[PDB]
Design a protein around this ligand. Structure first.
Ligand SMILES: [Mg+2]
Ligand SMILES: [Mg+2]
Ligand SMILES: [Mg+2]
Ligand SMILES: [Mg+2]
Ligand SMILES: [Mg+2]
Ligand SMILES: [Mg+2]
Ligand SMILES: [Mg+2]
Ligand SMILES: [Mg+2]
Ligand SMILES: [Mg+2]
Ligand SMILES: [Mg+2]
Ligand SMILES: [Mg+2]
Ligand SMILES: [Mg+2]
Ligand SMILES: [Mg+2]
Ligand SMILES: [Mg+2]
Ligand SMILES: [Mg+2]
Ligand SMILES: [Mg+2]
Ligand SMILES: [Mg+2]
Ligand SMILES: [Mg+2]
Ligand SMILES: [Mg+2]
Ligand SMILES: [Mg+2]
Ligand SMILES: [Mg+2]
Ligand SMILES: [Mg+2]
Ligand SMILES: [Mg+2]
Ligand SMILES: [Mg+2]
Ligand SMILES: [Mg+2]
Ligand SMILES: [Mg+2]
Ligand SMILES: [Mg+2]
Ligand SMILES: [Mg+2]
Ligand SMILES: [Mg+2]
Ligand SMILES: [Mg+2]
Ligand SMILES: [Mg+2]
Ligand SMILES: [Mg+2]
Ligand SMILES: [Mg+2]
Ligand SMILES: [Mg+2]
Ligand SMILES: [Mg+2]
Ligand SMILES: [Mg+2]
Ligand SMILES: [Mg+2]
Ligand SMILES: [Mg+2]
Ligand SMILES: [Mg+2]
Ligand SMILES: [Mg+2]
Ligand SMILES: [Mg+2]
Ligand SMILES: [Mg+2]
Ligand SMILES: [Mg+2]
Ligand SMILES: [Mg+2]
Ligand SMILES: [Mg+2]
Ligand SMILES: [Mg+2]
Ligand SMILES: [Mg+2]
Lengths: 141, 149, 129
RNA sequence: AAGACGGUCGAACUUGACUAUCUAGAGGAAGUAAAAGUCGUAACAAGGUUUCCGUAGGUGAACCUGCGGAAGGAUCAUUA
RNA sequence: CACGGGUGACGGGGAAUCAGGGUUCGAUUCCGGAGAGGGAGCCUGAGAAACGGCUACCACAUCCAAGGAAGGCAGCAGGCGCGCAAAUUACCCACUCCCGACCCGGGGAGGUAGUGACGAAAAAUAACAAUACAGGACUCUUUCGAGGCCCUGUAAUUGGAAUGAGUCCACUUUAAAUCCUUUAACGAGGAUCCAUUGGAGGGCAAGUCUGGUGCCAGCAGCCGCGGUAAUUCCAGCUCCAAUAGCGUAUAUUAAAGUUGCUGCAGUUAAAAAGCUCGUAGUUGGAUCUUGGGAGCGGCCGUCCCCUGCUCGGCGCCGGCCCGAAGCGUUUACUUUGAAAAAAUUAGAGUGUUCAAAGCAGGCCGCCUGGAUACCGCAGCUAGGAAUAAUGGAAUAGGACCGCGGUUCUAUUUUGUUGGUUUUCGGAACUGAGGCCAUGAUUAAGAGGGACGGCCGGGGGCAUUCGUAUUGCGCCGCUAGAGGUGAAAUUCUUGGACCGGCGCAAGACGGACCAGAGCGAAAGCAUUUGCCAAGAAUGUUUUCAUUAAUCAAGAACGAAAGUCGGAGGUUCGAAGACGAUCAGAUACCGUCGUAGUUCCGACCAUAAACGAUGCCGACUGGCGAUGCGGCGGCGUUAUUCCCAUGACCCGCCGGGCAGCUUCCGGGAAACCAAAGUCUUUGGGUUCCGGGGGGAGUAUGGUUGCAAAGCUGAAACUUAAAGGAAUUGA
RNA sequence: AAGCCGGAUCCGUAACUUCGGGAUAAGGAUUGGCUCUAAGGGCUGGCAGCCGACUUAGAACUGGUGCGGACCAGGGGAAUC
């Protein structure tokens, strides 16, 4: 610290209160402006209906067409772009069906070479997408 | 350092270790103080009463020849001033500077000084009021300060 | 200005000790500094010292040995119980074998070991090792 | 006993005001990111007019010019 | 830090993580509060503003013969809806308790079952031997090989022995049951009674194996992999990690000394207000009780002593010693004692088969346990008196000591009932006294002030001088002059430029002028006069803590700019023209408006820089410089010597700086401060938290305006940046 | 064109702005009669007596909710030129 007197407790504590707001991690946690902008509303997972299948080009040093999907969250109505994680899984996904969507690793931050997506599909039609990939289960018909 | 200046000076007086009256000084305590009274009757602050005593009469410090300081001698006799001499000279100086400002107003430097003399008065004024030598209602007014020099 | 006179004595001693000087001069003398310096003698960290006595706050000339590493003051003077005494010596002392905390109690200025034996805490002043 | 003058507590309704959150909007103007796009070359070397700060005016665009500053200068130095 | 606003806010005991500190959580079984769809009002009652009570309105909603009646699951189950997200419309009062008129009744309180990978403890998925094989220590053997006294592992080879998962007689448990425990009988060779989840470039333990694709598919938290020989994709094999578990998304804790009280940083990386003044806030110099005496042990360590004033007892001879009521600057601090619910945490005892647990159990009726520690802060109690505040006697309106009065006045006093007055005590005032050792710490290498001689491009007002520039008048001779890298626009026989003589105006104060001075910063340079101020030095003067830094607030603040007057020589934003050029709305040249100048008001911003807050202390040298003082051989001026000026040699105190250094620090450049820092704490103000978005939007406030101060978010991005090195 | 409002008292009052305004912004409540209560002063010799003159505020009662009862007596707001 700088002030060291035995009767400067109020000065030290009040200075700390002001200076915690310059911490980026603390500012977002203790202001709601970050949570309102969050599509999930603070939840870890969310369910939504599939509106379209969209492919996004990867960043410049890479060259690919990432398989994504446009969904509208049931609890909110907000549009998000979820990423179909594994290889060839996009064929299991058709239009206008219920999927379960979670985060994609970096807590609301873009991750990997994929430009501007935060989310990842984990379940479709109430069956896990990993079971579909391994052949353990089939789509519900 | 100085209260209202960037200088850091060291010039000051050094009292000798011995605090006894010298053997050559024959002026005694009882006949020291009536000389102080008559020099105060001429009209002289205690600062310059002691100045003209230790160069013309050999009395170095009246606190050693007499039992008390000069201002205590005067006030026990009733000749202490209405207000302390150090506060008096700040007020006399502020009057002189303030009078210079009404004659010429572009003197920005002279205006800046006026805060420094006035600030010293208020800092010194509240000290004497805690010591109960000035009344609690004593206030420095720039308009009426001229009358009391 | 000068707010603490013990902080100036310990710092002045440390500067002279760290450079290998034989004598150091503490400009203001107080009962606290004199009492702090005697605690520094019972354990052989300094030699004997003089108190030049003018009619003001006196001076002190200390005979320095090479036996001192760092003397330091703790400001402000916190109030420490005997339960908390163990923690303080765990932060500002090199090892459990040597080094002393000099703290003032109702029984006088004394080190932490001999304060623990008479079961009395107080306010910390400093340390040496 | 039903009932009535009055007093008190007072829900609810209508209107007005005030406040908080969200939301539409012709048009206008930014920011960011995709690009083998058009126009110049402003900054990096004395970057080819040294660079930069405050202010003011002007020009397709970078920018240019006036005044006073700084060296983060391309001089720690220039002689009776 | 009121008032207002927000709370993804019921409070607390507690929970998670943690060295020491802390951060986050606490709807949830205990205590307290509030509520029964939202409000409002009531009856009964000891107790209600009660809702498994009532009365209305509001929202919802049920039955109907259409007249009417009836409702309140945030009780147990169960249904819908909402969602990422949560169990049976089971059994019994057998236990713990509660209620009643009661030993006898009731209790969706509560208990027992069912669903249950929230999570916590224990623990299967093999053990052994023989054969071959491969090694090891043993011996012979230069080796091979040989013997196994001794091992060690491997092998869909062989061989028997031990069991639990499961089926199931029964007993035990229980209200009746189930489960656990017990025990008959079946129950294991590929013991198919067949263990998963993630990975194998690095961080990070483990294949440059093989096949497929070929910047596609895809992998990848990050750096990155993939374009026809992929250690990373899709697969087979092999290997690695934890193990009945493991991966993923999200909130949060440590890591984070990246929120720093312990314990960060601010020259160049992000950063110190342009500067000073200033009240709240923080912090505050020294100074008043020392020591002596007892005992033991070895000069030392431990223990003892250093305020008095109603009643009874070690009691003794009006007195003493002691005990008990109370009295006696106040705190802060520290030790002590009480009181502080359990549960939880720490912890004592105790073989639940061990453990998580529990409060039980042990011995041949008895012996027993069910402790203890912590529980901040605040409040209560008694010791200690260093440290830090605070008080006393200074117009004495002082402390003790007794004397003299006046007033009010308790009750012992007059044999037993009534009246006065004393003494007597208690309270108050007042007069004259005695006496104190009678009563004021020092005077800071803190500060304020006075004084003396100086000193300075410090400030204001007025005056005075200088050459130059431009313009004009006259005179002389002449055809070019200006500018450029080269030219041109430009002036020019109507005489330009050049030379002389004068006049007018407005700017500006060269050379002297320096790593020199002053000023808070901005800034400040001809002479002289006036006015006010100022540092430093000198001081045996004065007061005695009056101080340092400072939210809010206040004064000054270059240039540019804004508003009114005056003046406008030079230069010159805008503008016009001539060049240059691919273009040239520029650099270059000619002209030229606002401005630049003075006066009176605004504005408050600069690379306002030492890119470096202020106060105080300490830690190496050396030579100069400026101001003041002090001392000393000697030259020179006054002249007529003392004394003064100019030089020379030193010392002291502030000042702007310089050189050097293994003081020390730092990432280094470098810094005697940017040192005295993991050996971290002298005091205090401001301010930074990856790069952008952005000093932007919006709200507020100031301004005539331009603009100044305060100041986000969405979103985007693995870097941006500092110092130094080698190349180009 | 006619019509609505109109006085006074008590509340309440926006955008914008040249900070002067806007403003009677806009929008609400009251008003009769009767009987009382309190407050607001001069002269004479903190008290006593004697003189008074008009206003305000409050309260009870009361009428078929009627009361600036006739007369007098602003409709308002959002914008453009
Ligand atoms: Mg990359
Ligand atoms: Mg100050
Ligand atoms: Mg260029
Ligand atoms: Mg350039
Ligand atoms: Mg160029
Ligand atoms: Mg450059
Ligand atoms: Mg230009
Ligand atoms: Mg920079
Ligand atoms: Mg809540
Ligand atoms: Mg709770
Ligand atoms: Mg809740
Ligand atoms: Mg209730
Ligand atoms: Mg409900
Ligand atoms: Mg109720
Ligand atoms: Mg119910
Ligand atoms: Mg109930
Ligand atoms: Mg669940
Ligand atoms: Mg029962
Ligand atoms: Mg029963
Ligand atoms: Mg198995
Ligand atoms: Mg079983
Ligand atoms: Mg790895
Ligand atoms: Mg590895
Ligand atoms: Mg990997
Ligand atoms: Mg593989
Ligand atoms: Mg953390
Ligand atoms: Mg740590
Ligand atoms: Mg940091
Ligand atoms: Mg910087
Ligand atoms: Mg600065
Ligand atoms: Mg002190
Ligand atoms: Mg407890
Ligand atoms: Mg000159
Ligand atoms: Mg300020
Ligand atoms: Mg200016
Ligand atoms: Mg100007
Ligand atoms: Mg003008
Ligand atoms: Mg041109
Ligand atoms: Mg030009
Ligand atoms: Mg010109
Ligand atoms: Mg600035
Ligand atoms: Mg700076
Ligand atoms: Mg530190
Ligand atoms: Mg930042
Ligand atoms: Mg009309
Ligand atoms: Mg209007
Ligand atoms: Mg228009």
């Amino acid at each position: 610290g700088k002030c060291r007197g035995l009767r400067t407790a109020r000065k030290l504590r009040s200075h700390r209160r002001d200076q915690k707001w310059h911490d980026k991690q603390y500012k977002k946690a203790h202001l709601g402006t970050a949570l309102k902008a969050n599509p999930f509303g603070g939840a870890s997972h969310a369910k939504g209906i599939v509106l379209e299948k969209v492919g996004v080009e990867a960043k410049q040093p890479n060259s690919a067409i990432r398989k994504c999907v446009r969904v509208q969250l049931i609890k909110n109505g907000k549009k998000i772009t979820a990423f179909v994680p594994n290889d060839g899984c996009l064929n299991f996904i058709e239009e206008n069906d219920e999927v379960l969507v979670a985060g994609f690793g970096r807590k609301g931050h873009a991750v990997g070479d994929i430009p501007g997506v935060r989310f990842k599909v984990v379940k479709v039609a109430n069956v896990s997408l990993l079971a579909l990939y391994k052949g353990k289960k089939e789509r519900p018909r | 350092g100085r209260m209202h200046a960037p200088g850091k000076g060291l010039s000051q007086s050094a009292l000798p270790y011995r605090r006894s009256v010298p053997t050559w000084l024959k002026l005694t305590s009882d006949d020291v103080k009536e000389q102080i009274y008559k020099l105060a009757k001429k009209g002289l602050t205690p600062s310059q009463i002691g100045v003209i005593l230790r160069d013309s009469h050999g009395v170095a410090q009246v606190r050693f020849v007499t039992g008390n300081k000069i201002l205590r001698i005067l006030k026990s006799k009733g000749l202490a001033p209405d207000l302390p001499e150090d506060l008096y000279h700040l007020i006399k100086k502020a009057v002189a500077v303030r009078k210079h400002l009404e004659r010429n107003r572009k003197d920005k430097d002279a205006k800046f000084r006026l805060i420094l003399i006035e600030s010293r008065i208020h800092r010194l004024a509240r000290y004497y009021k805690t010591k109960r030598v000035l009344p609690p209602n004593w206030k420095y007014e720039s308009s009426t300060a001229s009358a009391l020099v | 200005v000068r707010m603490n006179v013990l902080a100036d004595a310990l710092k002045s001693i440390n500067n002279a000790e760290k450079r290998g000087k034989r004598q150091v001069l503490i400009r203001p003398c107080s009962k606290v500094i004199v009492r702090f310096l005697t605690v520094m003698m019972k354990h052989g960290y300094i030699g004997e010292f003089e108190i030049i006595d003018d009619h003001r706050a006196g001076k002190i000339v200390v005979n320095l040995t090479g036996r001192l590493n760092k003397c330091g003051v703790i400001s402000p003077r916190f109030d420490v119980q005997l339960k908390d005494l163990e923690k303080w010596q765990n932060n500002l002392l090199p090892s459990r074998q040597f080094g002393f905390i000099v703290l003032t109690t109702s029984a006088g200025i004394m080190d932490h070991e001999e304060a623990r034996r008479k079961h009395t805490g107080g306010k910390i002043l400093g340390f040496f090792f």
